[PDB]
Design a protein around this ligand. Structure first.
Ligand SMILES: Cc1cn([C@H]2CC[C@@H](COP(=O)(O)OP(=O)(O)OP(=O)(O)O)O2)c(=O)[nH]c1=O
Ligand SMILES: [Mg+2]
Lengths: 218, 1006, 57, 436, 69, 65, 57
DNA sequence: CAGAATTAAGCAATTCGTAATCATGGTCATAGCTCCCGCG
DNA sequence: CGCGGGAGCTATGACCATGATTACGAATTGC
């Protein structure tokens, strides 16, 4: 649980000891991308760009990866909205509702799940824009997902178009599930039963299956 | 009104449309917006079974449906392959829907749009105007493409517009980052509809002081402060970076036919759009021709996984999200797909492409004046060199030294160049346009106006070099022919590989032959034996070797025996010789030999001993007459190659016919490829089996064949090897040769379709016209049906070190004895890309040495082993001690992919480490230069381990450190093992290899 | 010929011993077979010395 | 041109691929008791999951050591104290232990091969697996050409209710008892012997496996003394028609039972030698040991066939004798009425519609190979050295070219009976032509 | 000879009898040394044949128990 | 000869070979007697008795006292 | 006719032994005398065993 | 209202590097095993 | 006089190191 100084607006960024092998390169990449990144108003606050750097990676066996935060009201934690207005976490909660048989809930949060680290590939985006900070976060996103997939057993990707390159963005073999995004049309995310597939692929790796009922906020 | 299809391009989002980019005769760009809707093919009862009616449905007629599944039958009796003829209707929906038991799902909607509406994507059409509906100026909308695109007028030349560009960026580090490094130059080649090629370079003015800016204004450069002040006619324009980016943006938003870059989607266009988003927040907005939907320039990565091994990601190409119709074309990706070169950096492509032989008229102390014309090299090669010399700056002489162009003269039939070259004794030297031989980061450290104008010249050389590679590879002609043949949009032609480009003419054929292919069970992959390779009879041939090459062997196999998945009657297998004999006789009586061909093939399973594939030749399959279409295209581009005179057009049309040969062998290979829907293991296995029996037949006929008294006789009879045929089987064949020509032929080597026929004559012209007589006599009597061979070459001094590895002098059928031979290397060290240039140079020199001491015959074998190993000893110790040769002639190269069975593969780990440490990100499919590098304090290493750990990827900005050195030992190990593979006295070779490298040398066994 | 009848009784006893070796040798355990192969290498050494004495003298 | 993805991704997340992943997990948990068919299905699902997901936790297997010792604890050769509770005492028989996987095909312990079984007993076993899907495998024993269901190892249901349903289904079960143990009693040889006498089973039982109700894991207990007995001769006695079990007779006269042929060849039993035999008061049990001689397996086959007789051959797990084959053996293998002529045989196969289905479904060669009881691999090896002259799919003349296979005495014996094979082959060929 | 419980007494009897045979072979060798040092003229071709059959029989008895795995 | 150590070592090292050859003669004689051939042992008895009384007088003459 | 000349060579060798012991036996020293005395008792034990072999019949 | 949209040619044969496997040899425990001395 | 304690030699099986063989995959090309 260490902090490394950044020249730009997130001056102190806090990282767990599991994140330590890639922080000397993350600071190098962020000190060149941030001076042009922070001109645009970012959907998460820059003070909370790296609040999932605080999460350990040894206990996590599943990485759930979105490509970016929400275009508005980004809290820095992927797939968290305390107002529960976002359709992506709503459809995630619907899929887990069919999974776990839990119909009564007030929100869903993937950060409180043991063994699941909710990840945004690009750590920020502009207000009202999707994948706008792609060019800023390409190198940092590559390096951080390189680091995550060394520790987690199963990577789940929430984008079919957005994570089509993910076998090139990663180079270490990891269990990669490129799933449909919850906000994708045709209700393809309603149709797929990927969260069981996460547990079965963990059972293939002799890992503890994710109890997805931990994510519900009562 | 008459148009010619420039490009087809589809828009997505909201209402989904297809667009055509077209040009009329007067020069107006005309767009036709079609409705783009999904295409499905179902039976008539299924078409009435959909409760939601389709948006449109028009009848395709009663079309037979063939279940192309391979079931091995131990008994002779086979179920007839399903031939359910039903009336089929084209389901046309604007929204994607899933239909149960829907057929023909392998094809794209765009090919279905082409063929069901009868539109050729490379065609000229008189558009029936009342079907067109005018949206705005230049854009029309055609609801009924069948009736509007009905008149296919022939070709007319159109004013095709272009924009060729490279950019240069300031790297104080090894490689530019977007965020910290500015753009120095953006060089542009604006070829508009009026046809004049405007060559202008935009120069950044924040990289220079106002003393240097006003000096540039005094020297003729134009200084601008806005977009409207910009003049495209001015050769050199000074501007701010933000105005430079706005000029770049407004040029890229122009509706060109082609914006062509080299490595520019990956670097130049991405850098332009990202630096434009950084400095001013603007984006390069591509608008649709109806101005409905507009997208920004976002370079999307596209990855192609491999189809062998673990199916890892093997190639990465970058493209532009365009919807205005401009074919944004990266030449890096195209030449990576097409050419086979050590690296596809632009200066290596300029090494390979614009290589001309130059005579010397004047010699000076520091200036060497080269002349090149139709007498020095091939016709049209000197125009191509002069065309590059119009903007070229540095010319590489004999691929080793790089010389700056002092003064440029463009002749009528060649070039006149003055080069900063040391005085060289020979008169004719190879001239290539490859390297600049500069430290660009060093010129960025001490940037001035003279350095700015020099890199403006180099940047406009690169931008026009995109055009010279465009015309050298003939990419608009290649694009048009690929669009017509593969029935694909012009922007889609090279981007897909074989499997998609088959599907266009395959769909044309399956609608023509009224046939649908379906599969019920899963496709199962088995290993099958390929084409037969014969061991060489001996290593050296003093005596001339005739080369007989089948005209498209595996296509002619598939056409001859009607090898398709759909015409496979079934597969008869036997675990035992008893049911093999029963099935053999009962196979002959059930299936007649003319209409059905039984191919005795290699078993798919270990318990089976025979696997006989039966093909119905009564009705022609879709794979054979698809191959007939592909060899028709190859034959017409081959006869356009024959009528071609200039070397550039000859290279274009030779690449055309080679590409069509490759895609015909891909119609082959998709039957061997499991994940294709044209997969037919029996058809591909029997294709290799018939090709095996044909090369065995042509070998056994040509081996032991003698010519006597003007009569050519063969050792074996001229029987069709699969059945009794109507043609006579008499090996006694009358020639049109003189009586006194008594010469004996024997086969010494055979690789798949190419038998190497050693005639005992050494006369070149005699062997050539005797071999033309042999080619005529085999094509008239020995071969049958579609099978033809061509006498390609006479191989003199054929040095076969192994199978698939030979060096020889080639005399073609058009060439004579007095004509100069072309030294052909096939699979040897000069060909291979994992072999360093120093290795290639000493293999060439020692091949020359061994050839001359074996041709003289004065000198014995043990002592020539002595002196050539002592010469190797002194050369390798001089190279290890002096280290005079640079790093670039010890650079290996390999393709960066992810197709690795091991997670911890050292090559993959090397590229990932270099991608972490260096600002270069080596993409997938990139060919990177790497060398074995060790610290210089390490002495000569006897026993070699951890060789992959000594690999260091070499960049053009990479310089070898003083502490580091080239690991010469393993290069010398490979060189020594090839050299002792060349020559005799193996025990001394073992001792020599053991004393120098602590190891037993690898040795070939014949 | 006392030496000849002594060697004849030796080879008859050893023939009976090798027949019961064939009787027990299918299921001899590893330390068992190691010991009896050690004794058979001692056999080969002893008959090597005996052959040297009958050859050289 | 971005509308065809950066790199197209399959529908991993679809439900059918979840069923493939769950099947991959189920056959991964069943690796040690699956056949080669389910091993190939597991490897197909592994390569699918590796092409589909960029890594999976499981890897491809080239060979699986087929052992069920995770469910079955170490064999106790000494008396012990049994805990209080309810137990299911099941007798372990002498023959080769076979296991019926969830893939509806029978697996051999120690080899993993699929032995080929009669149709009714496979149908009964498949209906047993259709009754209870929680059964991991059905432990079977092949002794004297009989399949006894030893045990039904299942996750949930006790084997006691399995056994009565299998006995109604036609399967062979032991007469087993379930009892309480009142107190900590030394499980000795006397209580073992009266437990064996309580097992009213004529066929030999080598040990007893008891199942706790509290614990799913079960343990085999076995009280014996190792013995090494001199061997008078080796005999075969006929257990089915053309089916002979090997047997070993000692000099004292007591008969050592032999499991299969490959037990006799693996342990290298020779006359006038010593073999490892487990000794009981009731019978003798040959140990499953490897022979320590330097004699190769083919020369053991040489010597065994030379001692027994030249017109005996190895047929899988049982010896088979050759003889003059005719319509009687074909009607016996077809399980149909005895028949005088081939015409009458054609008629009765037409009368019995399922027998006509069996004639249509398998080939002439497989029928004529099974009717004389030839092995699979040995007879394919014999025919794969011979050239045949044939009229009308009938062997008029047979000759052999390569005599390297005649060093195999089973292949030599089957070559001796190849005239009778040709006669039955022409008979079955005429039957297949006249039916169809 | 019949129905012996363990091979350990049987192989111990085998080894002890074979120690006696090694002792007797060394004994006949070292008295052959004495009769050769005596200087009596002897012809030992049949003795060489006897040791040839001895070596063949010892090799036959050895080869069955040489190697594990 | 000085200090008589080499003499004692010499007279010790041969007598073990002597008793080895005596046991060899005994074992060859056992091998003859177990062969079953008819034998007379009179001259051998005379040789062993004169060896025995020469050994006993040597033992009486080698006493330490 | 070989065992008799073998024992005759043994008798001649022990004649050499007894003559050299009688030559050196003017001084013998006590511990080596006790060692050769126990050697001679072992000699007489072996001779008594061989005499039992020649006199058992 | 907050993305999806499938491709993908085969095998033969050589070379080279790496890693598993095996032949050969060196070394070390280890049982035979045999004698020296000794003490009752 | 007879067997136990001790010590030294000596083949002999097991283990380990070194180097040669070979399967095995990548890289490449020929086809
Ligand atoms: C090049 C190539 C060839 N093949 C097969 C198919 C046939 C044989 C011979 O083709 P060849 O190159 O000699 O020339 P060929 O195709 O026979 O045509 P020409 O000899 O040029 O007329 O090899 C293939 O499968 N894949 C390929 O990429
Ligand atoms: Mg060809």
């Amino acid at each position: 649980m260490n902090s490394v100084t950044i020249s730009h607006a997130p001056y102190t960024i806090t990282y767990h000891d599991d994140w330590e092998p890639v922080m000397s390169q993350l600071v190098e990449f962020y000190n060149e991308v941030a001076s042009w990144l922070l001109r645009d108003e970012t959907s998460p606050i820059p003070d909370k760009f790296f609040i999932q750097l605080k999460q350990p990676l040894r206990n996590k066996r599943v990485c759930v990866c979105g490509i970016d935060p929400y275009p508005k009201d980004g809290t820095g934690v992927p797939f968290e909205s305390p107002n529960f207005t976002k359709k992506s976490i709503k459809e995630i909660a619907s899929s887990i509702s069919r999974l776990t048989g839990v119909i009564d809930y007030k929100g869903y949060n993937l950060n409180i799940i043991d063994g699941v680290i909710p990840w945004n590939y690009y750590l920020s985006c502009k207000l009202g824009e999707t994948k706008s900070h792609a060019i800023y976060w390409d190198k940092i996103s590559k390096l951080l997902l390189q680091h995550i997939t060394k520790h987690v057993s199963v990577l789940y990707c929430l984008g079919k178009t957005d994570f089509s390159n993910i076998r090139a963005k990663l180079e270490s073999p990891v269990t990669t599930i490129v799933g449909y995004h919850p906000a994708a049309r045709d209700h393809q995310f309603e149709k797929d039963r990927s969260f069981e597939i996460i547990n079965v692929l963990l059972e293939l790796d002799n890992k503890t299956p994710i109890n997805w009922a931990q994510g519900f906020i009562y | 009104m008459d148009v010619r299809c420039i490009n087809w391009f589809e828009s997505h989002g909201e209402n989904r449309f297809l667009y055509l980019k077209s040009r009329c005769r007067n020069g107006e760009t005309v767009f036709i917006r079609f409705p783009h809707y999904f295409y499905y093919v179902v039976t008539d009862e299924i078409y009435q079974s959909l409760s939601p009616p389709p948006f449109n449905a028009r009848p395709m007629g009663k079309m037979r449906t063939i279940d192309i599944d391979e079931t091995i039958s131990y008994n002779l009796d086979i179920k007839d392959r399903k031939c359910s003829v039903a009336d089929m209707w084209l389901i046309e929906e604007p929204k994607k829907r899933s239909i149960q038991n829907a057929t023909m799902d392998e094809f794209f909607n765009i090919s279905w749009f082409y063929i069901s509406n009868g539109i050729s994507p490379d065609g000229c059409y008189s558009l029936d105007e009342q079907y067109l509906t005018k949206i705005n100026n230049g854009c029309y909308h055609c609801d009924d493409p069948r009736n509007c695109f009905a008149k296919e007028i022939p070709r007319f030349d159109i004013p095709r517009s272009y924009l060729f560009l490279d950019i240069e960026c300031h790297f104080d580090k090894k490689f530019p980052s977007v965020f910290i490094n500015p753009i120095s130059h953006t060089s542009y080649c604006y070829i508009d509809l009026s046809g004049k090629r405007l060559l202008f370079t935009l120069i950044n003015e924040e990289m220079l002081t106002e003393q240097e800016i006003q000096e540039a204004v005094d020297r003729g450069c134009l200084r601008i402060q806005s977009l409207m002040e910009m003049d495209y006619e001015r050769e050199l324009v000074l501007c701010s970076e933000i105005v430079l980016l706005r000029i770049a943006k407004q040029l890229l938003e122009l509706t060109f036919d082609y914006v062509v870059t080299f490595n520019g989607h990956n670097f130049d266009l991405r850098y332009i759009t990202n630096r434009l988003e950084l400095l001013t927040g603007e984006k390069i907005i591509f608008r649709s021709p109806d101005k409905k939907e507009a997208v920004h320039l976002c370079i999307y990565e596209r990855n192609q996984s491999s189809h062998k091994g673990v199916c890892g990601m093997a190639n990465t190409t970058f493209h532009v999200n365009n919807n205005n119709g401009t074919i944004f074309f990266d030449l890096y990706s195209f030449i990576q797909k097409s050419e086979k070169l050590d690296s596809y950096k632009l200066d290596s492509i300029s090494k390979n492409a614009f290589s001309c032989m130059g005579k010397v008229l004047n010699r000076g102390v520091r200036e060497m004046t080269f002349i090149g014309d139709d007498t020095t090299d091939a016709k049209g090669k000197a125009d191509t060199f002069a065309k590059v010399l119009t903007t070229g700056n540095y010319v590489t002489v004999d691929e080793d030294i790089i010389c700056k162009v002092i003064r440029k003269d463009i002749l009528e039939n060649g070039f006149k160049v003055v080069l900063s070259c040391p005085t060289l004794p020979n008169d004719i030297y190879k001239l290539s346009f490859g390297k600049d031989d500069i430290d660009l980061a060093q010129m960025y450290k001490d940037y001035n106006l003279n350095i700015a104008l020099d890199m403006a010249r180099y940047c406009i050389h690169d931008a026009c070099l995109c055009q010279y590679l465009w015309e050298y590879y003939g990419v608009e002609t290649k694009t048009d022919a690929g669009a017509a043949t593969y029935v694909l949009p012009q922007s889609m032609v090279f981007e897909y590989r074989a499997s998609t480009i088959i599907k266009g003419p395959l769909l044309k054929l399956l609608l023509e032959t009224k046939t649908i292919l379906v599969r019920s069970e899963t496709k199962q992959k088995f290993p099958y034996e390929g084409g037969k390779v014969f061991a060489p009879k001996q290593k050296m041939f003093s005596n001339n070797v005739l080369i007989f090459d089948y005209n498209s062997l595996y296509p002619n196999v598939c056409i001859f025996g009607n090898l398709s998945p759909e015409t496979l009657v079934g597969v008869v297998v036997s675990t035992n010789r008893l049911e093999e004999e029963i099935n053999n006789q009962l196979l002959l009586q059930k299936y007649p030999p003319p209409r059905y061909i039984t191919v005795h093939c290699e078993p798919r399973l270990p318990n089976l001993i025979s696997e006989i594939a039966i093909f119905d030749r009564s009705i022609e399959g879709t794979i054979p007459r698809l191959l007939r279409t592909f060899l028709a295209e190859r034959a017409r581009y081959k006869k356009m190659l024959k009528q071609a005179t200039s070397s550039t057009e000859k290279a274009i049309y030779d690449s055309m016919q080679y590409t069509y040969k490759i895609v015909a062998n891909s119609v082959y290979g998709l039957m061997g490829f499991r994940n294709s829907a044209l997969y037919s293991y029996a058809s591909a296995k029997s294709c290799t089996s018939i090709g095996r029996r044909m090369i065995l037949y042509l070998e056994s006929v040509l081996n032991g064949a003698e010519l006597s008294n003007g009569m050519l006789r063969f050792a074996n009879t001229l029987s069709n090897p699969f059945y009794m045929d109507d043609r006579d089987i008499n090996p006694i064949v009358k020639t049109s040769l003189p009586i006194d020509y008594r010469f004996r032929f024997r086969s010494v080597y055979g690789d798949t379709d190419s038998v190497f026929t050693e005639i005992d004559s050494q006369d070149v012209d005699k062997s050539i016209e005797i071999a033309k007589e042999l080619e005529r006599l085999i094509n008239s009597r020995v071969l049958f049906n579609n099978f033809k061979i061509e006498f390609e070459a006479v191989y003199k001094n054929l040095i076969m070190q192994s199978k698939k590895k030979y060096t020889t002098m080639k005399y073609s059928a058009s060439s004579n004895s007095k004509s100069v031979p072309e030294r052909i290397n096939k699979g040897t060290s000069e060909t291979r890309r994992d072999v360093s240039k120093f290795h290639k140079n000493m293999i060439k020199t020692y091949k020359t040495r061994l050839s001359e001491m074996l041709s003289e015959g004065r000198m014995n074998s043990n002592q020539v082993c002595i002196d050539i190993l002592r010469s190797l000893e002194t050369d390798l110790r001089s190279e290890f001690d002096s280290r005079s040769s640079p790093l670039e002639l010890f650079m290996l190269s390999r393709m960066h992919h992810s197709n690795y069975k091991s997670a911890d593969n050292p090559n993959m780990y090397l590229v990932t480490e270099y991608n972490k440490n260096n600002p270069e990100t080596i993409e997938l499919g990139e060919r990177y230069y790497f060398a074995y590098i060790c610290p210089a304090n390490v002495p000569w290493t006897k026993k070699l381990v951890n060789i992959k750990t000594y690999e260091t990827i070499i960049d053009r900005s990479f310089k070898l450190g003083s502490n580091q050195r080239i690991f010469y030992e393993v290069y010398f190990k490979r060189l020594t093992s090839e050299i002792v593979n060349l020559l005799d006295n193996k025990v001394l070779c073992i001792s020599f290899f053991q004393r120098m490298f602590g190891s037993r040398p690898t040795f070939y066994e014949a | 010929s006392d030496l000849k009848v002594a060697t004849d009784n030796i080879v008859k006893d050893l023939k009976k011993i090798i027949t019961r070796i064939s009787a027990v040798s299918t299921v001899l355990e590893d330390v068992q077979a190691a010991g009896i192969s050690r004794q058979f290498t001692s056999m080969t050494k002893a008959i090597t010395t005996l052959s040297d004495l009958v050859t050289e003298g | 041109m971005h509308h065809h993805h950066h790199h197209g991704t399959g529908s991993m997340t679809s439900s059918a691929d979840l069923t493939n992943l769950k099947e991959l997990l189920s056959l991964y948990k069943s690796l040690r008791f699956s056949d080669s068919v389910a091993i190939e299905k597991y490897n197909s699902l592994v390569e699918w999951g590796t092409s589909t997901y960029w890594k999976i936790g499981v890897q491809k297997v080239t060979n699986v050591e087929t052992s069920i010792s995770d469910y079955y604890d170490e064999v106790k050769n000494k008396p012990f104290n049994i805990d209080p509770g309810y137990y299911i005492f099941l007798p372990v028989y002498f023959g080769s232990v076979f296991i019926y996987s969830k893939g509806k095909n029978m697996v051999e312990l120690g080899s993993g091969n699929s032995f080929q079984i009669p149709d009714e007993i496979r149908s009964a076993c498949n209906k047993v697996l259709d009754s209870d899907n929680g059964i991991d495998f059905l432990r079977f024993v092949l002794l004297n050409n009989r399949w006894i269901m030893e045990d039904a190892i299942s996750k949930y249901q006790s084997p006691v209710n399995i056994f009565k349903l299998a006995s109604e289904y036609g399967l062979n079960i032991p007469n087993y008892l379930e009892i309480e143990i009142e107190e900590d009693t030394l499980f000795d040889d006397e209580l073992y012997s009266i437990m064996e006498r309580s097992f009213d089973d004529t066929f030999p039982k080598i040990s007893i496996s008891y199942i706790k109700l509290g614990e799913l894991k079960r343990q085999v207990v076995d009280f014996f003394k190792f013995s090494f007995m001199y061997i008078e001769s080796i005999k075969v006695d006929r257990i089915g028609d053309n089916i002979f079990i090997p047997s070993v007779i000692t000099k004292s006269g007591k008969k050592i039972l032999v499991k299969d042929v490959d037990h006799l060849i693996r342990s290298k039993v020779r006359e006038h030698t010593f073999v490892k035999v487990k000794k009981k008061n009731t019978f003798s049990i040959l140990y499953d040991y490897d022979g320590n001689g330097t004699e190769t397996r083919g020369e053991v086959i040489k010597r065994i066939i030379d001692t027994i007789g030249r017109d005996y051959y190895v047929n899988g797990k049982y010896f088979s004798k050759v003889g003059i084959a005719g319509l009687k053996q074909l009607t016996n293998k077809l399980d149909i009425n005895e028949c005088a002529t081939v015409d009458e045989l054609v008629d009765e196969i037409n009368k019995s519609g399922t027998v006509k289905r069996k004639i249509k479904n398998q080939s002439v060669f497989d029928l004529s190979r099974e009717c004389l009881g030839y092995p699979e691999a040995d007879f394919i090896t014999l025919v794969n050295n011979m050239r045949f002259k044939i009229e009308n799919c009938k062997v008029v003349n047979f000759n052999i070219e390569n005599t390297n296979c005649l060093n195999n005495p089973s292949i030599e014996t089957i070559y001796g009976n190849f005239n009778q094979f040709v006669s039955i082959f022409n008979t079955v060929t005429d039957v297949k032509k006249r039916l169809f």
